[PDB]
Amino acid sequence: TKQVSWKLVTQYALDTKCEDVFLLMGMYLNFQEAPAACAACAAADQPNHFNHHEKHYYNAQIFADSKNQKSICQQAVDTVAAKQRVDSLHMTREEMLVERFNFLLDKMDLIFGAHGNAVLEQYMAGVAWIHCLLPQMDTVIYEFLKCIVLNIPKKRYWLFKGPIDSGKTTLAAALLDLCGGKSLNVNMPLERLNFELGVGIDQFMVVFEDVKGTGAESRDLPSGHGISNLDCLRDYLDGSVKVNLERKHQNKRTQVFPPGIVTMNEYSVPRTLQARFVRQIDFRPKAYLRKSLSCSEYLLEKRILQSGMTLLLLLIWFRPVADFAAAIHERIVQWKERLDLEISMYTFSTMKANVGMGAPILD
Amino acid sequence: TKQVSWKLVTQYALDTKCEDVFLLMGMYLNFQEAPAACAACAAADQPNHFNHHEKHYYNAQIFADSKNQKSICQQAVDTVAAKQRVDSLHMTREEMLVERFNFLLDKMDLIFGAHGNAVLEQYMAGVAWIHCLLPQMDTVIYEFLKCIVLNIPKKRYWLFKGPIDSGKTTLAAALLDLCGGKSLNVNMPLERLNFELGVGIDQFMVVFEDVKGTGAESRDLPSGHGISNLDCLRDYLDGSVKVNLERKHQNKRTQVFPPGIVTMNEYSVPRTLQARFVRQIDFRPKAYLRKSLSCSEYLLEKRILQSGMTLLLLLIWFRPVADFAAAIHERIVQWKERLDLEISMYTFSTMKANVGMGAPILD
Amino acid sequence: TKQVSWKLVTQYALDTKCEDVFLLMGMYLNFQEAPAACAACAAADQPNHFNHHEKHYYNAQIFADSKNQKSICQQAVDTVAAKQRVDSLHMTREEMLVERFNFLLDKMDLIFGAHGNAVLEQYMAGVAWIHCLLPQMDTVIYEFLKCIVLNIPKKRYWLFKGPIDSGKTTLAAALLDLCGGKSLNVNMPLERLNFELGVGIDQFMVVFEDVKGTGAESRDLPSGHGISNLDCLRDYLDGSVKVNLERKHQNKRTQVFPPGIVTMNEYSVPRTLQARFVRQIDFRPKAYLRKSLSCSEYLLEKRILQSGMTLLLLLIWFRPVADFAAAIHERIVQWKERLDLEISMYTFSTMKANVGMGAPILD
Amino acid sequence: TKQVSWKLVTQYALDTKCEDVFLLMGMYLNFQEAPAACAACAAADQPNHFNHHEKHYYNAQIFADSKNQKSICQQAVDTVAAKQRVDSLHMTREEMLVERFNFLLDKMDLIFGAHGNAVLEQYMAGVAWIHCLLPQMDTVIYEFLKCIVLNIPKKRYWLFKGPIDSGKTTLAAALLDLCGGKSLNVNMPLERLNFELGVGIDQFMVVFEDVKGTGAESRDLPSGHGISNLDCLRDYLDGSVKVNLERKHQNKRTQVFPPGIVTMNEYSVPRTLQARFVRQIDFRPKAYLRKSLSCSEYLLEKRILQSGMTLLLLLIWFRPVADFAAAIHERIVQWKERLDLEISMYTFSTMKANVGMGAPILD
Amino acid sequence: TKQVSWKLVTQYALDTKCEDVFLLMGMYLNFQEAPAACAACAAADQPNHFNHHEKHYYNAQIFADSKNQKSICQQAVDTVAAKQRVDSLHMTREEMLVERFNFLLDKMDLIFGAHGNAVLEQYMAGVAWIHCLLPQMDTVIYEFLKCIVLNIPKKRYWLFKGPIDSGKTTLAAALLDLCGGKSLNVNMPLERLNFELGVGIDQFMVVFEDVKGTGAESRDLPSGHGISNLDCLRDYLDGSVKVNLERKHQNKRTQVFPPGIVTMNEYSVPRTLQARFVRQIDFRPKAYLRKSLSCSEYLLEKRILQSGMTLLLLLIWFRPVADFAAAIHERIVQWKERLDLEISMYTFSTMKANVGMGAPILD
Numbered sequence A, B, C, D, E: 001t002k003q004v005s006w007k008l009v010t011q012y013a014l015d016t017k018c019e020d021v022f023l024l025m026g027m028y029l030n031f032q033e034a035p036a037a038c039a040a041c042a043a044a045d046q047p048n049h050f051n052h053h054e055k056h057y058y059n060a061q062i063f064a065d066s067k068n069q070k071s072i073c074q075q076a077v078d079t080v081a082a083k084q085r086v087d088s089l090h091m092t093r094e095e096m097l098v099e100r101f102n103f104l105l106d107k108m109d110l111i112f113g114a115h116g117n118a119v120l121e122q123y124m125a126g127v128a129w130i131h132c133l134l135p136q137m138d139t140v141i142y143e144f145l146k147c148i149v150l151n152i153p154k155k156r157y158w159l160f161k162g163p164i165d166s167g168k169t170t171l172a173a174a175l176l177d178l179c180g181g182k183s184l185n186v187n188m189p190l191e192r193l194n195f196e197l198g199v200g201i202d203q204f205m206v207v208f209e210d211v212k213g214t215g216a217e218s219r220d221l222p223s224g225h226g227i228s229n230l231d232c233l234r235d236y237l238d239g240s241v242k243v244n245l246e247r248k249h250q251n252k253r254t255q256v257f258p259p260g261i262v263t264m265n266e267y268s269v270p271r272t273l274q275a276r277f278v279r280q281i282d283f284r285p286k287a288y289l290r291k292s293l294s295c296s297e298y299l300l301e302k303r304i305l306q307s308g309m310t311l312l313l314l315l316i317w318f319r320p321v322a323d324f325a326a327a328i329h330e331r332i333v334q335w336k337e338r339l340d341l342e343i344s345m346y347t348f349s350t351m352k353a354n355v356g357m358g359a360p361i362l363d
């Protein structure tokens, strides 16, 4: 009887950085149809479909006949988890960001390509908006990446502080998507905290999203455990010593907890937790930024401002090829040519001027 | 020894969107009897029975002899879950609603057909009642579907507010059945909340049914955690960032939480949770609507007002073929001809007039 | 069909003291590429890669074709756990430290070698800083190792007491890395404590890191259960009787709980818990040590002061070959020659003088 | 393919009373090396190594090639648990103590033998110290063994009451090691108590170590649930009726809970819990006993006073061969000859005199 | 390869009413030794050993070579549980007591036989003591058995009320051993109660041992939840309706909860819980009964008063052969002849007279 290559399914999971057994089962099954009569092949909607369709077609047909599909996908997903463990100990944090970048560029190459649906001019309007959020933004993003890559103890966490609709969440999300990693909710009590901090295992960075303090009901701020919990998580935030992180059906992982961001409202920060942050960026709602967005509907509809591709487009536009690792230089040059065709320094400056007047960014 | 095609059982589960292992085992076993001497074949009661009976008959006989029935059905149900994961990432939300629509029309074609038991005139009396519940109802339902399909962050949740027996529950249920998805109970404390929000995994939409607030015992309103919890679930309701949803024996899923509805009584909405809703629809008990229903017993007995087929019948009656995706145009035309035979604009208007006088809708 | 040697995978896990199934899967898979065309082979970055690449290459290719990779690695990791159990009962605590030392020297030989990236002069600047932290430091570290190796009941725990940024954490971490073992958090309540103390199973030593007391909010010290819990854990700290330690999916282990350190701020120690510690070392922030470090950035960036290799480099520099077990004498002599080439007693004394003036240690 | 004898691995586990799967895996693997070139064979350090090395050598080599090591050891450990169940119902409590004695004598024969490291004169100095702790000590130990062996309901528990460093813990530990069994912590609340009392399953005796009462903070005594819990555990302490004891992944065992000791500080004992103890021994710190020990460092360093071998050495020295079961008479005579060579009634009396003056026991 | 008869191991478990997998493994393994050279065969200590040794000897040797012993014993123990389920629904409660009786008589035949160790005259002294505890005792025990066998709703529970050392526990234990069944602890809160009441599954009777009430600290009575809980367990105690009982890894069993006894101190019984008991027996400490026992040491030492064999010996002595089911008449006659040889109505009456004077029962 015909036998499926577990090695080939693993290769596909490795190529797509697949961490989901059900999505792998689903993705691998869609390869069983003939590429000459396939709808998703000729339409070129997924890169993980037409490029791999030929390589996995025969194996996918065999797979469609397996009595043991879930096990095949479990070992593939486990090999992907096994790759990340080796990487976290033998890969330099620079090579870790190049990987993330190459991943974001594949998704970029797809959607802006002659078989994609996204509009590049709209993403560049996102870059305009983002570049208006803070002064020296392209340098603020570059200083963040240096900080996260270098991972220097006690100089690893940035604090984003401000009211709702100030840009703190959007930028933290954008950077989280830029570097790769997870967002964490430390508002739960110390008891259930342990399984939450375990989500941090093998992550390149974390965002402690919307951390809450107490005695701020008078400022219309809700109470939560987040601020006090963060004072107790000194070892995690400082990253001088390794910590024992827990998650279900697994021996508790030991590692230096990841660096990243903490976001919160205008709560008073305890003296001890304040010294844990190397930098603090204060965000305030600017009327021109909100009206601009209200006029540039596509930015919300397409989730452009929360996109890591948007911050990558920003770096490609503002920074020369030398500011990127040698491993993606040819990919940077290609994106630089493409962006040049769509926008210029004069038109970009006009987009920023349109943000400043709170008018639709694109005329 | 004779071997069962796991691939054929999976095909049947895929055809029927089967998420239940026990119902799949049961359904597949009933196919083992001869279609020439079968009772359920000639009676034509289930579409998932006579249309598939021929295709699965021999395999069902083999299946009846298997020592491993539950495993066969586990992989079939897993492949269905795997399809939804791929769909949630590679299918447009428009194609997701066309699927739901095609599903509802199969159930419609069955029950109103020459082997069904439901009375079409009674469903059209349901449409009358529903079309009386709010002005421009056919447009209110159409604006909801646009909102849910487009899934624009911060403009994704509608609030249905009113006392008991006002129509808010009925309509939320009707729309929930129209789009497909799950209802959620956030009245439990933050601790047990996490497994509840996980029910939202791969769902096209959610309904936070009967959300309770505090300090309303004086208005004869019971206390619950629902309102405060919803303020803390800002990330979920806004859908700008992806969230980590949990459920049993599964790695915590990351996705933009689904859009939908929140239903509640006349509790004061905190300023912060009020801005999370794009639209708020106020429902008030109308005496003519309750008496009408008291006179039109069939509507409760057959659960017509909570039916998504009822809202689909409404759209088919009020909207031209062009307001529907091209993929169901032939199916719309057929239903339009069928409805024409049973009702007219003059008789429909009379049904609405009968609702307005609180008389039985059908004379 | 080709069969993988489970015995060879176990041998590799045993060689590398591997306790992680996912890292073992990952490490063993990277051996499948040709050593003549391999990138990690010629670069000589991991010792667990090029030295074992030849021995495990063919088996790794077979392993890449296995339908049962996780099970193979489970038995390998279990055999490593089984080795530690036999060792904890049949190995002298002196042989246990020689093993830890040989492990640290392999990592040392790697990073300072002609294919490593670490700078030896920078580690020796770490030794300078550490040797300034307390008087007779080389003797304080040697008295700690005697204490931990001899494991005399009631004379097994040292207390490191002082404010934040005093050196207590750094040194406890450094010694914990020197001896091998785990850090424990006893700040959680007595209920969840049991699974925490189980982390101590087969450990050569433990560090109860940052133990908190009550009624110290007035000294800007946060409350925690740690101090009271430690009074109740008399049996564990005294080590006269064996204790029943618990962890998931395992029969509760019975053994004399490990010795080690307790770190805490300037909380009042209850009379009963004070007598449990043979020695108490008071740490105070010295301005010259902090400025020195602020000037010697490499120490934080490379985590030199928390390194057990740093304390081993210290012992190799200060102590003659006779102060080490006979089993590592040839390894001590080699490191002594290497250190001599880079630094002298005159230049070391200058480094200490630079610490004392709070200037960058290396000129 | 070569097949491992599961029966031979079980025989080894049975011989060594092995209750640990990981230690069995480890122990059985060390037998695979050639006994003619083995280091642990010629050194004669473990009796479970050289005596069994020949018998298990070939099977251990086969075992080293097994793909199913953990299962083999699970059945071996289960057979050992199965032996204890049969023994607890078909073995007389006298035969149960002879087994414990034979076990202690094997460990004794090993360490004092021409390939052991322990010094017999030092253990006899331990006997001196212990024989000074209470008058008629050799008779106090003998009355305890009668009490535990006979297991007469309501006359089964002895209470050891006194301050810290009084000898109560040491003696309870010594007797617990003499009889075999487990120590229990009943200071946890009634909720978590059930899994703690389950540790008592098949145990020959138990020690409720350091039981705490309330309203004693004024005497510098910490509060705990232990005293009240013990009043509620009337059925367990009385042993007239069988009790349902619980532990993980097992059907709740029914048996007469084991007899033993309760240790506690100078807390007031409730009238009802006082009648549950047949005997109460009051321990007070004697300055001469503490100074003696401070002068006889070897006693702590080697854990001689907590050793059951120490109490066995005591009985062998004080009691004639007739006071022991006929099954160990030849073993008693041999130890009597050996002890005679090292010590005399005159020199023993001098050791006791040295304890009484608080001087080092050995001159 | 030689195959073990799972059917034969099941037959042995069925014969011995074995509910323990570990004891079955142990018992079945001891049959592998030659019966001609076996020690336990010729000594005739266990009936489950020499009578079955011949029948299971060859299978036990095969079993000693099995790689799957625990599974074999799991199916045997499951078949025993399966027998009890069929019995509980198809066996009359009279046949259920005959089974219990035949079981007790096998243990009786063994211990009093020419290869047993128990003294019959001592058990008859137990009968004397028990027959003194309450007037018309032989009739009080017979009325209890009628009550439990007939199992008439609302007339199923007897209340044993009195202080400690009054006889209530002893008699409840004696009757519990007479009928077969389990003792339950309802002093835990309603939350953990559900798994406790599940112990009642397939049980012929239950004893709610030492039920505690509140507001009795003034009478030197400890507080517990037991009394209030019992008011809430109306359905269980009344046995008119079936109840859903829960236990681990099993679908919640539905049945009429078993009848039995409730024991408690002199707490006030709430009016509602008082009507749930058909009979209430008041026990008071009698000085003559305690002194008698103090003089008849063998009764405690051998646990004669808590023995169901003791109550069976009582019925055999007091009641004619006709008061027993026809199925055990030959067994009753044999015991009647045996008892006649050891004791007479005149000597029994003297034993009762010795109890009444508080003197040792046997002269």
Ligand SMILES: CC(=O)Nc1ccc(Oc2ccccc2-c2nc3ccncc3s2)cc1
Binding pocket: A165, A166, A167, A170, A284, A285, A286, A287, A289, A290, A293, A294, A305, B154, B155, B240, B275, B278
């Ligand atoms: C109907 C409705 O809810 N409308 C709505 C539309 C846009 C809104 O803004 C945002 C939404 C998402 C992400 C970022 C922002 C902003 N960032 C900044 C940054 C700085 N100064 C202002 C803003 S707003 C808020 C609400």
Ligand SMILES: CC(=O)Nc1ccc(Oc2ccccc2-c2nc3ccncc3s2)cc1
Binding pocket: B165, B166, B167, B170, B284, B285, B286, B287, B289, B290, B293, B294, B305
């Ligand atoms: C005996 C009994 O319980 N009778 C009963 C019968 C009908 C009732 O109404 C409803 C029941 C289900 C769904 C919707 C409604 C209503 N929707 C509106 C909408 C607007 N103004 C009024 C209503 S009623 C209530 C109670």
Ligand SMILES: CC(=O)Nc1ccc(Oc2ccccc2-c2nc3ccncc3s2)cc1
Binding pocket: A154, A155, A240, A275, A278, C165, C166, C167, C170, C284, C285, C286, C287, C289, C290, C293, C294, C305
């Ligand atoms: C921006 C920022 O956070 N800077 C920073 C830089 C260095 C700091 O110090 C330390 C950091 C890690 C480990 C040890 C120390 C010290 N040990 C002693 C020991 C004795 N007297 C002083 C010290 S400091 C603190 C903070």
Ligand SMILES: CC(=O)Nc1ccc(Oc2ccccc2-c2nc3ccncc3s2)cc1
Binding pocket: C154, C155, C240, C275, C278, D165, D166, D167, D170, D284, D285, D286, D287, D289, D290, D293, D294, D305
């Ligand atoms: C530095 C340090 O902690 N020293 C130390 C050294 C010895 C100590 O004693 C003991 C230690 C273990 C076991 C027993 C004892 C005693 N038993 C009795 C029995 C009767 N009267 C006195 C004692 S002491 C206490 C402390």
Ligand SMILES: CC(=O)Nc1ccc(Oc2ccccc2-c2nc3ccncc3s2)cc1
Binding pocket: D154, D155, D240, D275, D278, E165, E166, E167, E170, E284, E285, E286, E287, E289, E290, E293, E294, E305
């Ligand atoms: C040293 C010690 O603890 N001695 C001891 C010895 C015997 C004791 O009694 C009993 C023990 C077990 C079972 C029953 C009884 C009694 N039943 C009745 C029944 C009626 N009036 C009196 C009694 S006593 C109590 C304590």
Ligand SMILES: [Zn+2]
Binding pocket: A034, A035, A038, A039, A040, A041, A042, A049, A050, A053
């Ligand atoms: Zn394709």
Ligand SMILES: [Zn+2]
Binding pocket: B034, B035, B038, B039, B040, B041, B042, B049, B050, B053
């Ligand atoms: Zn049919």
Ligand SMILES: [Zn+2]
Binding pocket: C034, C035, C038, C039, C040, C041, C042, C049, C050, C053
């Ligand atoms: Zn290599």
Ligand SMILES: [Zn+2]
Binding pocket: D034, D035, D038, D039, D040, D041, D042, D049, D050, D053
């Ligand atoms: Zn050997």
Ligand SMILES: [Zn+2]
Binding pocket: E034, E035, E038, E039, E040, E041, E042, E049, E050, E053
């Ligand atoms: Zn026998």
